[PDB]
Ligand binder design. Structure first.
Ligand SMILES: Cc1nn(C2CCOCC2)cc1-c1nc2nccc(-c3ccc4c(c3)CCC[C@@H]4NC(=O)c3nc(C(C)(C)C)no3)c2[nH]1
Length: 271
């Protein structure tokens, strides 16, 4: 009503029910909107976000819609802390889901998770919109086992130098290409490299990439041409696709449209 924009949700319409976890912007909770509809609510901790810049960008993010992207519903900005309201995903983050051995996933199921994420990324690529922190920890799973991409773009609004600096403790070193580590040069092709590492995470059931190395050692080894190698559950055809993401030259890595075609082809050959 009066005083609320299209983007704005009235926080008094929210009921808070459970805590889901804590991350870069603070606490995230599960709740209901108008006593009926499941939602997730990010409560943005004081000092953690460039708030005015995010609010202006939220207008662009409200127009991004795809079945394999976590859906933004709105924001609450007339009070602090500000809230970000999204679709609720009942089975939690992909990294923890992969690590639960009781699921005993079949190889067909693993390739379907890769396809879910590739569909989302092809859509963002079509709108020239980078994720910038693609990894299994930033994907979520719903009650039907469908994987969706979460928190795309939000890296631009983090005020913590240990996350933003390429030599900081929280920087995603193990998901980054050589030109990001050396010159901090981000592009569609750095999202491509990260997607290859995510495919490796899926087929490895959530092991840490380069698990015997530090971040510093990983950066040096990548520069010398070392790469991750084939997980036991990945076929030769699947490993070819993930490895194509790691070409030293950025312009020789595929697009997400090409990767999606390749994944569909392997599904037809291995199903
Ligand atoms: C967990 C969980 N368990 N369960 C069930 C499992 C079965 O038993 C009952 C509980 C459900 C969930 C669950 N559903 C969800 N739906 C929507 C969103 C979230 C969500 C998304 C992101 C984050 C969290 C939560 C919590 C930790 C921090 C994290 N990152 C950011 O906040 C952040 N990171 C960045 C960047 C990438 C910019 C650093 N920005 O914000 C959801 N979590």
């Amino acid at each position: 009503g009066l005083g609320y924009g299209s983007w704005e949700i009235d926080p008094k319409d929210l009921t808070f029910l459970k805590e889901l976890g804590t991350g870069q912007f603070g606490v995230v909770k599960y709740g209901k909107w108008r006593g009926q509809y499941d939602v997730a609510i990010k409560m943005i901790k004081e000092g953690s976000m460039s708030e005015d810049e995010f609010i202006e960008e939220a207008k662009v993010m409200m127009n991004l819609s795809h079945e394999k992207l976590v859906q933004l519903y709105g924001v609450c900005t007339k009070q602090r802390p500000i809230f970000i309201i999204t679709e609720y995903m009942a089975n939690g983050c992909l990294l923890n889901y992969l690590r639960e051995m009781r699921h005993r996933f079949q190889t067909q199921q693993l390739l379907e998770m890769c396809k879910d994420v590739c569909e989302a990324m092809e859509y963002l690529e079509s709108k020239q919109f980078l994720h910038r922190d693609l990894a299994a920890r930033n994907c979520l799973v719903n009650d039907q086992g469908v994987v969706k991409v979460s928190d795309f773009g939000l890296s631009r609004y983090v005020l913590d130098d240990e996350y933003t600096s390429s030599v900081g403790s929280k920087f995603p070193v193990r998901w980054s290409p050589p030109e990001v580590l050396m010159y901090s040069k981000f592009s569609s092709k750095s999202d491509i490299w990260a997607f290859g590492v995510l495919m490796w995470e899926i087929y490895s059931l959530g092991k840490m990439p380069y698990e015997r190395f530090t971040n510093s050692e990983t950066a040096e080894h990548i520069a010398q041409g070392l790469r991750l190698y084939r997980p036991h559950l990945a076929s030769e055809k699947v490993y070819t696709i993930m490895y194509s993401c790691w070409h030293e030259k950025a312009d020789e890595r595929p697009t997400f449209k090409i990767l999606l075609s390749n994944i569909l082809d392997v599904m037809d050959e291995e199903s």
